[PDB]
C-alpha cells in the first residue's frame, strides 16, 4: 500500500507526525492517543493562521508586502484575545503600540 | 539537521494571504510562537492526565487544555478545527 501523510488525511498543513513525535519525546505521559497529535496540529495551524491573517493585514496597512516583526506586534496587541494569550511575551523587534495619555497632550 | 516550522507557517501564510511574504526575523517569531503554544497545551494536558491517574494523553485532554488555555473566540474556533480535524482524519 501507498503512503498518506496523517496531516493529509486530517486535512492540515501542519505536520501531524512530527507533533506526535514531540509528544512522545517530551515526556508528557507514558502514552499518546492517535487523535491527540491531530487535534494539537489543528490548533497550532489555526492559531498560526489567525496571527498571520491579522499581521498580514497590518503589513498591507503599512503598505508592505512582507511581514516583519512590527506587523506581528501590531496584530497581537490590537486584537484583544491574542493579546491576552500573549500577555507575558516579548516579540523581538516588536516596538510598542503608539499611545499617549490624554493628560500629556497640549492646550 | 536543525528542524523548524518555517515550511508550514509559510504554507498557511499563503492560504491566508497569497500576496504576502515574510521576513526571517518574523519567521523566527512565528516559530517561537508555535513552540510556546505547543508546550503550554501539552503541559496542561499532561497535568490533566496525571490528576486523573490516566496514563495517556488523548484528544480529550488536548481539548480540555485548549478550553483552559485559550480565551473566548480563540477557544471556540480552536476546539472546532480540532474536533473536525480529528473527525476528517478518523474517516480516511
Amino acid at each position: 500500500a501507498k503512503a498518506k501523510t496523517r496531516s493529509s488525511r486530517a486535512g492540515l498543513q501542519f505536520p501531524v507526525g512530527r507533533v506526535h513525535r514531540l509528544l512522545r519525546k517530551g515526556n508528557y505521559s507514558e502514552r499518546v492517543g492517535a487523535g491527540a497529535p491531530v487535534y494539537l496540529a489543528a490548533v497550532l495551524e489555526y492559531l498560526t493562521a489567525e496571527i498571520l491573517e491579522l499581521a498580514g493585514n497590518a503589513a498591507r496597512d503599512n503598505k508592505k508586502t512582507r511581514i516583519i516583526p512590527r506587523h506581528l506586534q501590531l496584530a497581537i496587541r490590537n486584537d484583544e484575545e491574542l493579546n491576552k494569550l500573549l500577555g507575558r511575551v516579548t516579540i523581538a523587534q516588536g516596538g510598542v503600540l503608539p499611545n499617549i495619555q490624554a493628560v500629556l497632550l497640549p492646550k | 539537521r536543525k528542524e523548524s516550522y518555517s515550511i508550514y507557517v509559510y504554507k498557511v501564510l499563503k492560504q491566508v494571504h497569497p500576496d504576502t511574504g515574510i521576513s526571517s526575523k518574523a519567521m523566527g517569531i512565528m516559530n517561537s510562537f508555535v513552540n510556546d503554544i505547543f508546550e503550554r497545551i501539552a503541559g496542561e494536558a499532561s497535568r490533566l492526565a496525571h490528576y486523573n491517574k490516566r496514563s495517556t494523553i488523548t484528544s480529550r485532554e488536548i481539548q480540555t487544555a485548549v478550553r483552559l488555555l485559550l480565551p473566548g473566540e480563540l477557544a471556540k474556533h480552536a476546539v472546532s478545527e480540532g474536533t473536525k480535524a480529528v473527525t476528517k482524519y478518523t474517516s480516511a
Partner: peptide
C-alpha cells in the same frame, strides 16, 4: 479549510 474569527477561510 479552517474558519477564522474574521470570517475568512483557509485554503
Amino acid at each position: 479549510g479552517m474558519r477564522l474569527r474574521s470570517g475568512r477561510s483557509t485554503g
